[PDB]
Design an enzyme around this catalytic site. Sequence first.
Site, short mmCIF file in Angstrom:
data_model
loop_
_atom_site.label_atom_id
_atom_site.label_comp_id
_atom_site.label_asym_id
_atom_site.label_seq_id
_atom_site.Cartn_x
_atom_site.Cartn_y
_atom_site.Cartn_z
N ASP A 89 6.03 -8.70 13.39
CA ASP A 89 5.06 -8.45 12.24
C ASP A 89 3.85 -8.54 12.30
O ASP A 89 3.46 -9.61 11.94
CB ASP A 89 5.64 -8.72 10.91
CG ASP A 89 4.85 -7.95 9.63
OD1 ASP A 89 3.62 -7.37 9.92
OD2 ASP A 89 5.12 -8.27 8.54
N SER A 95 0.80 -1.10 0.09
CA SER A 95 0.10 0.12 -0.05
C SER A 95 0.86 1.23 -0.05
O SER A 95 1.82 1.48 0.86
CB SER A 95 -1.06 0.03 1.22
OG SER A 95 -1.65 -1.13 1.28
N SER A 122 2.92 -7.23 1.70
CA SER A 122 1.69 -6.47 2.64
C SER A 122 0.32 -6.67 1.46
O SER A 122 0.03 -7.73 1.43
CB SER A 122 1.94 -5.07 2.97
OG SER A 122 1.00 -4.62 3.72
N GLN A 123 -0.35 -5.53 1.32
CA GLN A 123 -1.62 -5.61 0.63
C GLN A 123 -1.31 -6.60 -0.95
O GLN A 123 -2.14 -7.29 -1.08
CB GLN A 123 -2.28 -4.29 0.08
CG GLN A 123 -3.40 -4.51 -0.82
CD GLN A 123 -4.28 -3.39 -1.04
OE1 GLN A 123 -5.09 -3.31 -1.92
NE2 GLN A 123 -3.59 -2.19 -0.57
N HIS A 165 7.75 -5.10 10.16
CA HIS A 165 6.87 -5.12 8.71
C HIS A 165 7.71 -4.24 7.62
O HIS A 165 7.55 -4.39 6.46
CB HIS A 165 5.57 -4.56 8.86
CG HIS A 165 4.76 -4.59 7.61
ND1 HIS A 165 4.26 -5.73 7.37
CD2 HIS A 165 4.06 -3.82 6.82
CE1 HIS A 165 3.42 -5.83 6.05
NE2 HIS A 165 3.31 -4.54 5.86
#
EC number: 3.1.1.74
Length: 196
Positions: free
Chosen positions: A159, A26, A104-105, A172
């Site tokens: 994370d 993101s 992530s996303q 993260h």
Amino acid sequence: RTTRDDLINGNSASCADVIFIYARGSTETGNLGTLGPSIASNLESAFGKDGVWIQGVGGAYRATLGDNALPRGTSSAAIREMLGLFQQANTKCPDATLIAGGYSQGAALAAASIEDLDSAIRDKIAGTVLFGYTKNLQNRGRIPNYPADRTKVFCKTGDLVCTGSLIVAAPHLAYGPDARGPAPEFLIEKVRAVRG
């Protein structure tokens, strides 16, 4: 170096043997963000510049923070975009070995898209790497509908997105070394095993 469109700008008359499709996190810049370029450099070192196509997921994938909260961890439009790129690789370069990744996303996006592929295309994806996998707990460290032995998840201790929340903490943001080292290496190994 944060934007690569080797597949969409590529032509069926000069296909690479390997095609890597990668979804950024993101808010990340370009279509490769912070980790994709490092993976790409290592893939090119292993296969030669002419031996691999690097393609980030752009288009309808806006990589918006809010979309993490959607049930699949990204939007349906983004999933259709990444699906489209796997399908394009399959059509344009039917003999190419595919590899994939996301952060992530983008890890949720890679997992959702791969799940929704036809087996004929999915079977061509020799390996997939996921960093800061937001569906790690929910999916038991796997990609639904895809073999565990082709999947490598990088989820650091602490994370929190890997343990069922969407809270971003320092671990993260620490996947750089993984992206320069074991992540591309896994992909390279999987490709070399299939192609001989």
